[PDB]
Amino acid sequence: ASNFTQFVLVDNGGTGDVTVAPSNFANGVAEWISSNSRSQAYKVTCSVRQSSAQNRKYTIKVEVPKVATQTVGGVELPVAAWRSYLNMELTIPIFATNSDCELIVKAMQGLLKDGNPIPSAIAANSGIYANFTQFVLVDNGGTGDVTVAPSNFANGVAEWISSNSRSQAYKVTCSVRQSSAQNRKYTIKVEVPKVATQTVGGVELPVAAWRSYLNMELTIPIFATNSDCELIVKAMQGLLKDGNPIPSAIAANSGIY
Amino acid sequence: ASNFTQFVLVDNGGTGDVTVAPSNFANGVAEWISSNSRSQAYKVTCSVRQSSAQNRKYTIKVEVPKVATQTVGGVELPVAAWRSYLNMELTIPIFATNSDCELIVKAMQGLLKDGNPIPSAIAANSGIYANFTQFVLVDNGGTGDVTVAPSNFANGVAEWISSNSRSQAYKVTCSVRQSSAQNRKYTIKVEVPKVATQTVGGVELPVAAWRSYLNMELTIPIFATNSDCELIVKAMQGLLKDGNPIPSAIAANSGIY
């Protein structure tokens, strides 16, 4: 009986597996490593931390490597040419009952699955996909929809807002930026609200009690051809779908149970 | 026709009287002295003073002596070995109508009469009297009770709170502390609230418009045997009962009328 153990994640057809075993947690920072070679392992983190007196923040990063071969000095050194950085910070207040988080996770992971208007950007040209318009996202049974319309981009920072009320809208970002001379970094944050009612001063003000912050920074080198990113996206979004060993922690007691 | 004159106070069986005549008021501070000898007189004060723009504070101290004999140098000098210090500061707002003070006085003096759970402490071992629990205090006719339960003592400061609502609770303190090498000082404050309704922002918030502050500091030397304190308590509480020349001022126009 042991939780936080060797689990499964990103896969395709039948050839190479990605069993992610455990490794470190020093100073409150979970970490998972895969097979024999560390230089080709799939790092992932997770740490609990209450930010103040009315909230609970988290940190679940993810580094997706590449099974390449850096031959420098006559030796074929199996190392990754790049690594991903899916870092999702999520703040959950104490007032928010145990019925908000269940619908928050399916809104963060349930935001980038394998081609959604936000993550299809992370898998193809239209990183907007649609001349950037009103799209679909997080849903459940037939009652409330979440059409996310456009809004701002000032200074290179995409942003999407939903329906009538902004205080209950689903914010999302996206910005292209080459970090240096051999890489290409990104930034796709996500704020998932709550259709609550803050009555302060005798008025029922429809506002969110909290918001999510799914911020995925991804660095892709110029050397990495146009055949690495396709398998990187399905490794970032294809890392937290709706209960994977990493995101099931984002939906239940199980950290890696 | 003269008010603030020779009055009566603390007595027991038929032997020694305690007629407290007038004496000084310099700079707004009433003062009463008893018989021939000042060194054995029963000092008492009283002064009106509006603290700010929405309150009215007071100060009624009381020094109870001892008819002892300090023979130093071959002479029998009739002087007190100690003195009491029943100092009751009471703040009464302008908003509080002329129907709150009547029930405030019977709550300050009507708090320590001659053995109440708070003043029985001032007359015997159980200076709590009860392993410190829910007790009785100020009452009138049959409608609202004032059961004062326990609450805090952090750093040597007793404290009692009443019913459900703290904002309408009857706070009271008590702490033992030897001031030097020849004395033993105390501190028994008391805050009497008002079951009012502060509606600010459209909400009826049950809170007190004011609170009392019956703080009685009492110094008892080591030389003073275990036969002085019994007659000291009935002199402090036995000083303001329910209309005595000193506390009738705390219940009506009469300062010493």
Break chain A into its structural domains and give their ranges: 1-257
How buried is B216 (Cβ within 10 angstroms: 0-12 exposed, 13-18 middle, 19+ buried)? buried
Q: Which chain B residue's Cα is nearest to A201?
A: B201
- Which of B171, B175, B89 has the alpha carbon at shortest distance from B137? B171
Residues from chain B that touch A205, judged by Cβ atoms under 8 A, are none
Q: Which two tokens stand for residue B103?
A: 């029930």
In contact, A167 and A175? CB cutoff 8 Å: no
In contact, A192 and A211? CB cutoff 8 Å: yes
According to DSSP, residue A210 is labeled -
- A62-63 vs A76-77, strand pairing mode: unpaired
Torsion angles phi and psi, residue B40, rounded to 5: -130, 10
- Residue B201 contacts A where some CB pair is shorter than 8 Å: yes
Name the 3-class secondary structure at A231. Answer: helix
- Residue B200 contacts A where some CB pair is shorter than 8 Å: no
Extended beta strands in B82-165, E state = 86-88, 149-152, 158-161
Name the 3-class secondary structure at B60. Answer: strand
Rounded Cα–Cα distance for residues A195 and A41 (Å): 40
Amino acid (one-letter) located at A249: A
Element (H, E) at B190: strand B190-191
In contact, B43 and B83? CB cutoff 8 Å: yes
Rounded to whole angstroms, what are the CA distances from A209 to A36, A100, A234, A248? 45, 10, 31, 23
Q: Which chain A residue's Cα is nearest to B204?
A: A202
- Residue B74 contacts A where some CB pair is shorter than 8 Å: no
- Residue B199 contacts A where some CB pair is shorter than 8 Å: no
Rounded Cα–Cα distance for residues A103 and A56 (Å): 16
Residue B227 CB partners (closer than 8 Å, separation 6+): none
Please report where in the chains the tokens 């009624």 appear, as a residue. Answer: B60
Q: Which two tokens stand for residue A33?
A: 């490593």
Rounded Cα–Cα distance for residues A28 and A255 (Å): 13
How buried is B82 (Cβ within 10 angstroms: 0-12 exposed, 13-18 middle, 19+ buried)? buried
- Residue A74 contacts B where some CB pair is shorter than 8 Å: no
| Residue B145 C-alpha, separation from nearest chain A C-alpha, in angstroms | 33
Residue B187 CB partners (closer than 8 Å, separation 6+): B157, B173, B174, B175, B177, B215, B216, B217
| Residue A207 C-alpha, separation from nearest chain B C-alpha, in angstroms | 19
- Which of B165, B172, B166, B168 has the alpha carbon at shortest distance from B137? B172
Element (H, E) at B104: helix B102-108
Amino acid (one-letter) located at B219: T
Chain B, window 151-170: residues with a beta carbon less than 8 angstroms from a chain A beta carbon: none
Rounded Cα–Cα distance for residues A96 and B8 (Å): 64
Four-point Cα dihedral A158, A163, A165, A168, nearest 10: -70
In contact, B220 and B183? CB cutoff 8 Å: yes
- Which of A232, A144, A217, A149 has the alpha carbon at shortest distance from A187? A217
Residues from chain B that touch A201, judged by Cβ atoms under 8 A, are 201-202
- Residue A202 contacts B where some CB pair is shorter than 8 Å: yes
| Residue A206 C-alpha, separation from nearest chain B C-alpha, in angstroms | 19
CA A242 to chain centre: 12
- Residue A204 contacts B where some CB pair is shorter than 8 Å: no
Rounded Cα–Cα distance for residues A247 and A256 (Å): 9
Q: Which two tokens stand for residue B84?
A: 């009491």
Number of CB atoms found within 10 A of residue A180's CB? 9
In contact, A151 and A170? CB cutoff 8 Å: no
Name the 3-class secondary structure at B123. Answer: coil
In contact, B10 and B239? CB cutoff 8 Å: yes
Rounded Cα–Cα distance for residues B157 and B181 (Å): 21
In contact, A65 and A39? CB cutoff 8 Å: yes
